[PDB]
Amino acid sequence: RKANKELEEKNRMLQEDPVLFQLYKDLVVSQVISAEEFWANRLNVNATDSSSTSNHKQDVGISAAFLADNLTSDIIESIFRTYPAVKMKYAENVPHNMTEKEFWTRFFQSHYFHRDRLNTGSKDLFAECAKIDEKGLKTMVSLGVKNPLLDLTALEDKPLDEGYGISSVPSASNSKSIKENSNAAIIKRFNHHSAMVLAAGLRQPAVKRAKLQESIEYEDLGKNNSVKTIALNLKKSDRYYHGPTPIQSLQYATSQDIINSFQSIRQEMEAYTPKLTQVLSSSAASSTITALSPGGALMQGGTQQAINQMVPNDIQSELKHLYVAVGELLRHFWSCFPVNTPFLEEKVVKMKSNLERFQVTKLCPFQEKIRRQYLSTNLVSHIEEMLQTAYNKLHTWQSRRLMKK
């Protein structure tokens, strides 16, 4: 059982697959495989179902604001990633002047889920933060990342040297009323939300110049299509012409013999239409029918399939469980064998492999005392042969380690 946690992980793997559970039970009785080792094999996979996550790249807060209905809906998780400040405020309020249940009461409170104030829905507060932070990024903050260019005022020469020229209304602050002013605020929220969606995903002349560098030149001009695909040249085409299967017939004769055979075949072909071959054909047919018919001699028919047992399908299922358990053990022994590195640690790993192989052979002997004695079948001999092959490789490794010593 090792660690109570390792044992629970092994139990979960056994629960997932019925065939695996039977193999695990046989190994536990044998003691060939540790519960921790079984848990490690179960946890020997790639990543998770969603691996990293499933965050959106557009309209993350505008996916289903107060329309889908903490860590409940994936929508609200994407919204938390989209606005870090809103997520931080929610986390701080969780035990301070508010609870999670209280936050849910606020979520469905009137003027929010009911959309009776600030229109929108559950992204109303998010949009308020967006507009405010966009105005702050246009006043207090600016373009933090600004190199040779990558800016706005610096990108367009120097801001707007419009030192009282003729055009200025454009940004007419003194004139913003309510309807048009509200629409301008909505544009600010959308622009900030797009930046926030980019922020959720990852936890200008300079851009144009980089694109120009990518466009300049070609991959073919650099090298070719797939980098530098090396040419393939074969010194001997003759070796391929020769067949791996052994030559069935290989015989020759003298040139004079070839002339004699040609003369006889020329005479034989000219003779034709014997007609009276019926007597020979009738005698030949009588011999052929007996061989061609399934009854009688000269017929190729085997497939005895005489499995005298109680329930053969159940016996086959028991063998499959034994094969799965033995195969997993053989895979572990082969991994240890691959890393030879003849040393003291390698000898310890080889001793562990031997112990597990011997315990698997004891399990095969117990299986022989089961359905190979009661039902007189379960041919565990093949499973024993696979274990013997692993033992033979272990014996070869021991010989190599002795030669190294």
Nearer to other proteins, 4 or 171 (CB): 171
Q: How many CA atoms lie within 13 A of 309 on its CB side?
A: 18
Among 123, 188, 350, 357, binds other proteins (CB under 8 A): 188
Q: Which of 194, 150, 162, 155 is nearest to 57 (CA)?
A: 194
Token pair of 64 as six digits: 């289903």
Quote the CA–CA distance of 108 and 72 in Å, as a whole number: 15
- Amino acid (1-letter code) at residue 132: I
> Should residue 134 be labelled a site residue for other proteins when binding is judged by CB under 8 A?
yes
Smallest gap from residue 229 Cβ to other proteins (A): 4
Among 91, 258, 351, 355, binds other proteins (CB under 8 A): 258
Nearer to other proteins, 118 or 184 (CB): 184
Among 43, 88, 160, 351, binds other proteins (CB under 8 A): 160
Piece of 1-9, 35-43, 90-98, 291-299 that binds other proteins (CB under 8 A)? 291-299
Among 94, 284, 311, 348, binds other proteins (CB under 8 A): 284
> Should residue 316 be labelled a site residue for other proteins when binding is judged by CB under 8 A?
yes
What are the b/e assignments for 304-335, b being 16+ CB within 10 Å?
eeeeeeeeeeebeebbebbbbbbebbbebbee
What is the DSSP secondary structure assignment for residue 177, as one 8-state letter?
-
> Should residue 55 be labelled a site residue for other proteins when binding is judged by CB under 8 A?
yes
What string marks each residue from 210 to 239 as x (binds other proteins by CB under 8 A) or -? -x--x----x-----xxxxxxxxxxxxx-x
Among 183, 278, 308, 341, binds other proteins (CB under 8 A): 183
Task: Give the dihedral sign, CA 388/390/396/401.
Answer: negative
Helix axis angle for 344-368 and 312-336, nearest 10°, is: 170
Touching other proteins, residues 71-110 (CB under 8 A): none
> Should residue 186 be labelled a site residue for other proteins when binding is judged by CB under 8 A?
yes
Q: Which of 138, 130, 131 is nearest to 86 (CA)?
A: 130
> Should residue 268 be labelled a site residue for other proteins when binding is judged by CB under 8 A?
yes
Long-range contacts of 45-51 (CB under 8 A, 24+ apart): none
Spacing of C-alpha 28 from chain mean position: 30
Smallest gap from residue 296 Cβ to other proteins (A): 12
Piece of 22-30, 85-93, 360-368, 383-391 that binds other proteins (CB under 8 A)? 383-391
Among 67, 68, 85, 198, binds other proteins (CB under 8 A): 198
Touching other proteins, residues 362-381 (CB under 8 A): 379, 381
> Should residue 386 be labelled a site residue for other proteins when binding is judged by CB under 8 A?
yes
Among 7, 125, 155, 199, binds other proteins (CB under 8 A): 155
Smallest gap from residue 32 Cβ to other proteins (A): 15
Smallest gap from residue 15 Cβ to other proteins (A): 21
Burial of 377 (0-12, 13-18, 19+ CB in 10 A): buried
Smallest gap from residue 108 Cβ to other proteins (A): 23
Residue given tokens 């933090």 in the structure block: 144
Cβ(151)–Cβ(95) below 8 Å:
no
